[PDB]
Structure 1
Amino acid sequence: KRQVASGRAYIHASYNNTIVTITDPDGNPITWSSGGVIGYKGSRKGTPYAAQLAALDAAKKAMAYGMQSVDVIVRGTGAGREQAIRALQASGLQVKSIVDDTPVPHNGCRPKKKFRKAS
Structure 2
Amino acid sequence: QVASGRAYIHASYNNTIVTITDPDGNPITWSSGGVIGYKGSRKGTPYAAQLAALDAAKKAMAYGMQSVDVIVRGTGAGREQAIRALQASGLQVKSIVDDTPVPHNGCRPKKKFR
* Band of TM-score, shorter chain: over 0.9
How far does residue 74 in structure 1 lie from its aligned partner after superposition? 0.5
TM-score by length of 1: 0.93
Q: Is 1:70 matched with 2:68?
A: yes
**How far apart are residue 110 of structure 1 and its match?**
1.0
In structure 2, the residue corresponding to 1:70 is in which secondary structure? Answer: strand
Tell me which protein shows more helix as a share of its residues.
2
Gaps of 5+ in 2: none
| Cα offset, 1:4, TM superposition | 1.4
Whether the aligned pair in 1 keeps the contact of 2:8 and 2:70 (CA below 8 Å) is: yes
Question: CA contact under 8 A between 2:30 and 2:56: conserved in structure 1?
Answer: yes
**Structure exhibiting the larger radius of gyration computed from Cα positions:** 1
Deviations 1:65-103 (A, max 9, x none): 110111010111111100000111101211111100111
TM-score normalised to structure 2 length: 0.97
Structure 1: 5+ residue stretches without partners: none
Q: Distance in 2 between matches of 1:58 and 1:68?
A: 13
Percent of aligned pairs with the same residue?
100
Establish whether residue 106 from structure 1 lines up as the match of residue 104 from structure 2: yes
Instruction: Find the counterpart in structure 1 of residue 78 from structure 2.
Output: 80
CA-atom RMSD in angstroms? 0.8
- State the 4+ residue runs in structure 1 displaced beyond 6 angstroms: none
C-alpha distance in structure 2 between counterparts of 1:87 and 1:38, whole Å: 14
